[model samples]
Target chain A: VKIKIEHLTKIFGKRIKTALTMVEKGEPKNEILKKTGATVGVYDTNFEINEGEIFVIMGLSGSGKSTLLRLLNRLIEPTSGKIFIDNQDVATLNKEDLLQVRRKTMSMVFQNFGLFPHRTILENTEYGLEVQNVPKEERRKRAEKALDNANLLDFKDQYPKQLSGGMQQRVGLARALANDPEILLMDEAFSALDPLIRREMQDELLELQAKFQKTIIFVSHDLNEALRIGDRIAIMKDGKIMQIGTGEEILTNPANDYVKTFVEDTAENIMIPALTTNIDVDGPSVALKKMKTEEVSSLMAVDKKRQFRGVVTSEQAIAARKNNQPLKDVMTTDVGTVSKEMLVRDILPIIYDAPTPLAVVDDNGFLKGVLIRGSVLEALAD
Target chain B: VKIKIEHLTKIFGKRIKTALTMVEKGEPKNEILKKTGATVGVYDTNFEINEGEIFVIMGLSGSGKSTLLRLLNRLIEPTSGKIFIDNQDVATLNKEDLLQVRRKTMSMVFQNFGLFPHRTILENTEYGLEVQNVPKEERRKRAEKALDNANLLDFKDQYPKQLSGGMQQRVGLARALANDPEILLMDEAFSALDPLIRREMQDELLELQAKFQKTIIFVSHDLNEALRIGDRIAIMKDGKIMQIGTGEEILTNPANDYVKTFVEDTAENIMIPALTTNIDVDGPSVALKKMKTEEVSSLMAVDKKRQFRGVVTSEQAIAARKNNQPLKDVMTTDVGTVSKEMLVRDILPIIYDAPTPLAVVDDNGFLKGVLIRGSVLEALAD
Candidate 1:
């Protein structure tokens, strides 16, 4: 096995004793250990993150995603759980072995961005290397290379405060990469940003991932973000694994109700890629504008997420075709087409701006519904 | 003129030199005569609020929408500015006259729920009546009626702390209405609530306006909320009027770059009412299973906004009758659409989700474009 975790348990002595006594008769694990006990967070967690794969841990606030990340680096020790880094039992390692393992095999980026506030961006990015006692000249060269890799080479001299939040996170990311560790663990690093900035950072991460094939373990509550970045997502509810699978697998086949609700609410179906979706072998899909009375008799236009809008018959498309007028001219819009998650107030703008029927899809390009201007309006009016 | 102003201005003169300079400069307007040098918040604002119309003032924080509102209410003194309420110059009113005008001719609701925390809901509402020196018995009766109108009579005994933010705002609104003022001024009242709750409060406000037939002026920077509630909107940038017109007019014909940017960023289309008429409410086209031109001849094509797609006249409809099959078989899934406020980036997500071309239309059901997979791909690729 690339990684293995046996029956590991962690408990706050006081909490576990009270909870156990309230619910059951068996002696609490914490109480049993409390011959000399004092631990406050994280219950037993067992999962393996393997080579060349991205793993994501998603949980609500106070669910220990951050603490779990800290535990990985041994920056904070787990109360009583076994963690293996590259088949070497972490708890059994000597101090020197643990430090060596941390320096060479693992790196971490925190949410608050631990970049040195007083240092210039480049200097801050190089702090990790300096901490390892690397030669100054070599550290700067590696820092330059890392910044270039993260697309922040141009902002090298800027202070952390001078950088935009997105740029600051990039600096943090660059700092993490400076060490060239095989595994990178991020703790809610991009959640505090605005949606647009968050998306930009995600793109940055994707670009960086392409250049460096490091194993990444990310923590987040946003399912879409997890799906976007993770090769496999492990959803945690109440500190327990709810489901663990690829984005597509979890989306198409949710394991339980909790997983289903979480996935459904966070996903934009149309944005998702379809496992069964294939370009038709029949013929080239004709545009509604291209459909002539003599050629194709009908046309279909899929949304970006691949959901269904109202189907347009050739006769319907012809109205938009006289002058090669846009297909928007002939499309029939009243269908259960738009996604239910979209606001009714959004209908007017979507319609007026699009002048086209919108296919509302989910995160994975699954058709949710068609939002016809009329139907959405009626819904809003109601 | 529908509305007129003569040398209206608002300037603050707090320093001795500036105060003297203002006197020396041939008739420079002053906003507030204070002890210290003042910030010239609003230079000069001149406009009219139409009767029975929803008017809006939009600005980012510190752009002076609040100052202007307070000036309108005489809550704070304007150093020098001529104002009118229903063609009568408010500048001519004395202290008692101003009080009379406020009680019988205008009312204001603040963004902060200004309900007294110490009082029960009933007593908080009655406070307004007491201020007007209304008879004790009559004030109590009127307060009850107002509470009932605001849907808070059931919770009349509850303190402000017990109510949700939306409910607290409702109580504040009830207190304002207890005096039955003519014009209603709401200063960012709904901005503080959750999106869903804010929308609900807006709906309640609209309903209240429809029932009472009062003129209202509201302030907000959230474009969607402004569009949803305003009959006419005044775009403000740097304490200056950018544009003022009916929402339709301003949306269709923005007067300045500031207004244009705001209008372009909007997601609501002007096409709703017009497109709704073109909708085929008979049933979903996909359900028809089969559609002949002869059948769809009378039905019109519309974008998702239900804006006019094109007319499926008898000629085209008849030609399509040649090989009419299941509507699903004939239905083209390549077309979807949008309207004006849609961002260039939003097209891909819309296309990614839908199976048909997205139809883009104007608020008036005019054709804009058909967003299909290929076009969206091109846009996104750029």
Candidate 2:
């Protein structure tokens, strides 16, 4: 285990002892808050992060995600809890031991770049090392290498103001990495960057992780980002751990209503199988029936073996019916198709141009559903 | 047209005239900035927005997205430009004209919910109308209606401090809508909200747009948000307009490398056609041969009409060949497929469990290409 926590509780008021007792006794947080006017910052949160794993803690604001993260580093002192780093109790550490843990065991990267504007890139990268009273030459060498690792070696001499937001954040990451910490704590680190740059940073972090194999505890409110980067994720709500699982686990099987709503709201791959009609087995009459029932202008024609052949439009189906032909004889072979896994956003453009509904198919060309313009809009509008 | 901008420019320095001249001479903003020490806030930006259309200006911070938005309302005076609202030049407007335009014609919504803590939700909504010196009863009625429209009728009596962030933003929207402005300017309006609430607000804005048919100019740093809401988007970089087009146009065919990079970074549905083996004409031997050439353990089977049949794994194909059986007889009837339009993020889970590469197919079920695990990751990383 990289890190572990047990019975972590934080009370944001004068009655911390009372609230902690109530929490320990299994009294509800809301009732404690209502009765004692004490807010629960985190209540009995317990979890473990593994080595080299990106463990994401996700929740909305005031949901204890930030509180939980801060507690890990003792930045926000836990009212009552035990935090273990490499089996050493962090809460019990003395000032010197705590300093050692903070400086060498764990390093934190913040949401804001938090670099001194006057400092050069290398100087900023060397800040953590400087705090430890490392030799100037050795700190410089380490900082330079860190900058190179973050792809900012060329801009080492430039000030923070000279670099772009993404580059500045990279410097922040380098600053954290320069200490050669065993565990990295990131507090919504990439949230401040633009979406594109945030993605680039995420890729960068993943690459760095691949090389360093450092254990990471990331806090984020963005569900997609968590899904993308997190090896395992813990969802929080109102100072409590709601669910902890892999992205697939949380997505496919949410823990509760809150988690379900969250997953549904963000996930676009709802996987509604495409409505299809057979081309080789079913005649044009059958194609017409399927189209009419589905209230679609076209029917995706698949073979008896469930292989997608082509699309037969209502107009073409009628024409084939008049000619007494099979669906394949009338189907338009040039129709567009999207995967069943395609999200609403992915289908928006395809549906914009095409007059007919686009077919949804699986990898083996099995028709799943028809992606109508309305369907895409409805999904987004919700 | 609801709004039109022509040769709009804002130079933020004492050397404005020289910078303006350099700008007119087609000198690059960066070069002009370096030589003259004059920062270009906006440079020769031009675009026209139709009545009731959602126009989005997107860029990273310091890209003049906010500057352009502020310029729209004449909150930031342009050094050299023409902003026409209903054919009236805004830059040339007198104090009274500008105030009237600012008050009655255009209303701005900020990223931060700039709501007054002391004021009730209804009072906050009424503040805009009250400034215009509307009658007390009339203003109250308008504010109530606007609050109802924003789904904050129940919270109208509550203070801003009592409300959630999403609710406060709704009050902000309600306050804007109460004025019944001809044009709405939202400068990163939803950027401060959490992801789920942000999406909800986006949906609310769209629904409001559909209902009121209000002309809206929204500024966002997020590409997906812009793509979702903007009927047309203007890509800004270093205060210069790079390209402006409908989301579909910009996404499918970017004009420059910068725009291409932006598009490629966001767009996950870059359709790579699936690789397949035919079922109608191709025998078991041919299917085996194709799978071997592709160095794959499985091949998607489609008929001559390009209809999807199923999938034949290497083991199955080998067995079929040994038995001298047809491809259709040996191929698995149950096979997974994904549409060509599926985003890379959406395909991660499906590919995670699957043993073989997921087939990409069109609407007609024609094999597009094979989606290996690496392809999705590569697209996302870039």
Candidate 3:
């Protein structure tokens, strides 16, 4: 479940001499243009994904995100690097060993559901087991159970074309799980689905993750999706790792400009919490009930009505005369608050969509800090 | 301008007896279904479209939206109805006159961007004008102008395959506008582009509308886009108009359950003037220089800070305060002080994205009535 990548590099070319990998670093890559004239896939990189975590890798087209994912299963061999899956070097494995690893350890669900159009849903589910030379009856039973796991039992006899996108994807999940792989690799698997259906599929996958506790390696162009599903996310740009962190960390403090800029155009602003946010802890305010005339400074800064009001500093709240003052006037509204554990990516749409600046706040309506436009963009840029 | 539809009905069936026009009112559709199961589209509807208005027709696939657009273009003959295009009954026009009307009165842009792959963009732009028998030299000149108008002149010699989705769509627009028709019928023209590009295209179309002042009839499934672009939106369900109004009117006052529920799913909240709200607006001012007094009772509450707070009632703010204290002690901190005259649709996203209800403010952040989330739902539904 632990994946460690060190100094990974992939230069797609017919020969090392012909590849940009051998060219001078300061040059404008003219040699690449003149020689193979192909896209440079990836440069040196390092990262790790922990067990049972849903880790998302995101990039624009040609960002090498897919290429990196392919390298994980040796679908495409890395030109140079070290890749370890559960402490075994994937690069050191032979073809047969890699195939065995792929079949039993990791399975993929593609953006285009790879379900065989010619086969029934059950038949498709059984194909992997059948490939392993399992007895026909055993594979069929496994396929049946897989179909049930995907909630696609009723669709057993249906062709891929006859089913809805979400259903077809469910079958894809069923097949991947049938082999009972420890890792699920999804490449924008639900990107093609309708919005409502896509959300449903995400929920379904979340449920499956809970039941099986499988480590998920997912890829997507939708930043919101990455935030929603990823435990730790890696942002890629031009084949290099831009940033790597937990969903909350990436949202709250994106490592560089690329990640921050990507976050700017997201609708997830409504969902992302501010940096200083904390987990929801809704205990009755003892001070609020015990003393009606407590100083604004001493008050727990209850904006019970809202997620956060600028917190009244202990000094400011103690001096406050009455609760009747508008919360904005007394609560330090400029300073936003959010749970420390809240995902930062969730608040993207709020910023992207809002006409005014948004402040971050805690559950107690205490001001934490502002998710300034500059801070977000600054993180996404560098 | 005052376009009218009288007794419009479309019946799709192979046999005469099975036609939808034959179905008498008060007759059970199930009885008719038992006979032939013919499909009925747009049954006995009457309506009018104003001049220079952006009219929208929205429905899901197979909901008669495309059929209606085609019907408007006279591409498909109606079973029974009278269609007035610029005061002319298009349904009764002779073949030559109808063809002339099609060329001179209205132009259409299809979803597929039906450009000739073999022809250069220049040829495609000139094709429409040439087909209508414009002299070669004059049509070339006209097309050059249209190419300029559509921002495709630089790429006029390029084939459709060489262009981006947005550029190809511009070419399609050029082709439609080449003949300089007074009206434009768009059948989900921008639906195929990616989200960012789609929005950019929508903005372009709006710019074109501003420049050309052509009456536009647009069809789309994207409610936000429709509301943003359409001057008057028509919500269609089951081949009938559920509600029709400006975005503000629709969001403020929904007519029925179908529209109400649909609106509820799409809109967040809106802001209103506090003077119009239930609470008294005039009050004492303390620290009025630093604090922008917002009337909580009448105005809808919103947090300028976080997004997706949902809506809050004035009671929530007032309940937190004592009698007659500075409104600051009682004001919700999460709320933003916004003004009227802002686009209701533009503000809707902010409300949905806000952490708390938005505050209604004047030019100087003075108290205004707060808008509730329910009001936004009602507006969209109405």
Candidate 2 segments whose C-alpha is farther than 4 A from its true place: A1-94, A111-118, A159-169, A188-206, A217-382, B1-118, B158-382
Cα-based lDDT at residue B252, candidate 3: 46
Question: Per-residue lDDT tens digits of candidate 1, residues A103-214?
Answer: 7888888787877888899888888788899889999998899888767798888788877788788888878888888988898889766655776687567546656777
Candidate 1 ranges beyond 4 A from true positions: A1-3, A13-41, A93-104, A110-126, A133-165, A248-382, B1-6, B16-39, B59-62, B86-208, B222-225, B238-242, B248-382
Q: What are the per-residue Cα lDDT tens digits for candidate 1 across B1-382? A: 2233444445554454464345435433333344444656565566776666777888788677777777777787766667867677676678998888888877888888877888898888888678888789998898889888877789888898977888888888888898887778889998777665886787577657757767887899886666555666777653455545544445444666676666542232322211111223212321111122112112335432224544332223223333432122232323454666664555546655654444566556555444333343224223
lDDT of 2 by residue, B192-307 (tens): 88765776677567556756887998888877677556667788886544445555456445666787676543333433334456565445544444443333335677664556
Q: Can you give the DockQ of every candidate in the order shown?
A: 0.04, 0.06, 0.03
- Model 3 chain B TM at 0.68
Report lDDT (Cα) of residue A146, candidate 2: 81
Error of 3 at A41 (Å): 4.0
Model 2 chain A: worst 10 consecutive residues (lDDT sum): A373-382
Worst 10 residues of 3 chain A by lDDT: A277-286
- State the weakest 10-residue window (summed lDDT) of model 3 chain B: B282-291
* CAPRI level of candidate 3: incorrect
Model 1 TM-score?
A: 0.60
Q: How closely does chain A match the true chain A in each prediction, as TM-score?
A: 0.65, 0.71, 0.66
Tens digits of per-residue lDDT, candidate 3, A39-138, equal 5666666887777788888888878787888888788887778888867899888889888898899998898888899989888988888888889998
TM-score of chain B of 2: 0.71
Model no. 1, DockQ: 0.04
